[PDB]
């Protein structure tokens, strides 16, 4: 069962996919598995829908693992999935969120990259699309928000290569199609590592978002909640002022679609282990991150 699942270790793609099926079988009234597309290498791309029913309920999107080497994110995604089924009906705040809203969780946004980090190259970031003798596109430079503009690379061998055209990567197009066709997402949370940051748009431009004051206040509150558990210190701000200019990015696109509560998390740590975060930090990271995510969801509702 998902009660006996080992949440304190890193898993393979197949193990995560089997976990999805088990979670759905155990909680068929709460969670369902959607295929949003098929990866470059022919793998199903799966999103879990958490819902108590209703019609056109305002939705929260959460993507993890768009950058394959960021293993803490997929691991946190698995923990989140279980947490949603555990706390629904218990935690009054979370129960209220799921009674009024749907959550869509994509644990492994870049499945080809994930498999590749396990079997060939632990530090692989990009998708695995080919054409070139260089491989893959930065799926967080492929979105239709400043696509191809400053903040990405035009070189196919680059780690921030934007790709041939916006949404060229099926891993991105699949989300875009799903979210646009749904038509009522109110939050969009992209989960990355590392650096311990909570970021709002924009990456692609120095222009401040219309909702800067509100999203900045939400970020401050979420960061305080995260810190309360184990004392983990996060900074916050716009992507461009906090890390670097970045174009064709997920939350820049989602915000431009009218999805107001659009944030990118950068999880543990601050550089000691970097992407190679020890498995012993999976649970504490996921726990504290959940407090931050719940704070954002509460403000959305």
């Amino acid at each position: 069962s998902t009660n006996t699942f080992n949440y304190a270790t890193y898993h393979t793609l197949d193990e995560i996919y089997d976990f999805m099926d088990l979670l759905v079988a155990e909680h068929p009234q709460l969670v369902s598995k959607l295929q949003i597309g098929r990866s470059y290498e022919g793998r199903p791309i799966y999103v879990l829908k958490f819902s108590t029913g209703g019609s056109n309920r305002p939705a929260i999107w959460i993507d993890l693992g768009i950058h394959s080497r960021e293993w803490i994110t997929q691991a946190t995604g698995v923990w989140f999935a279980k947490k949603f089924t555990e706390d629904y009906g218990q935690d009054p705040s979370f129960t209220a969120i799921l009674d009024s809203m749907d959550i869509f969780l994509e644990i492994v946004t870049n499945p080809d990259g994930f498999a590749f980090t396990h079997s060939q190259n632990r530090l692989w970031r990009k998708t695995r699309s080919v054409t070139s003798l260089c491989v893959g596109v930065d799926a967080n430079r492929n979105w239709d928000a400043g696509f191809g503009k400053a903040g990405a690379s035009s070189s196919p061998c680059s780690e921030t290569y934007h790709g041939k055209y916006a949404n060229s990567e099926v891993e991105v197009k699949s989300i875009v199609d799903f979210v646009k066709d749904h038509g009522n997402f109110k939050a969009f949370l992209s989960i990355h590592s590392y650096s311990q940051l909570l970021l709002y748009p924009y990456g692609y431009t120095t222009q401040s978002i219309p909702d800067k004051t509100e999203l900045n206040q939400v970020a401050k509150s979420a960061v305080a909640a995260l810190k309360s558990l184990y004392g983990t210190s996060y900074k916050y701000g716009s992507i461009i002022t906090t890390i670097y200019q970045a174009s064709g990015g997920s939350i820049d696109w989602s915000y431009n679609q009218g999805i107001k509560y659009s944030f990118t998390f950068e999880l543990r740590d601050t550089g000691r282990y970097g992407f190679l975060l020890p498995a012993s930090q999976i649970i504490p990271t996921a726990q504290e991150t959940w407090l931050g995510v719940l704070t954002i969801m509460e403000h959305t509702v």
Partner: protein, 74 residues
């Protein structure tokens, strides 16, 4: 696989010096002790021109050579 389960990771032979290679199985490249890696790529960075706005790993920028610095993309 054994490599990952023992706490390590697969890397291309060209990214894992002999001294950091491990005998553990499952990689179609080689199992690597990533704790023994030095330089930009080894720490998850990418060499970029100096004028590229990035989060620099200053300790590894010298490995990138003239006109380049080590950036880590998050």
């Amino acid at each position: 696989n054994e490599c990952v389960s023992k706490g390590f990771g697969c890397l291309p032979q060209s990214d894992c010096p002999q001294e950091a290679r491990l005998s553990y199985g499952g990689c179609s490249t080689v199992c690597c002790d990533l704790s023994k890696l030095t330089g930009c790529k080894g720490k998850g960075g990418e060499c970029n021109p100096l004028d590229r706005q990035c989060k620099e790993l200053q300790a590894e920028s010298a490995s990138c050579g003239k006109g380049q610095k080590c950036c880590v993309w998050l």
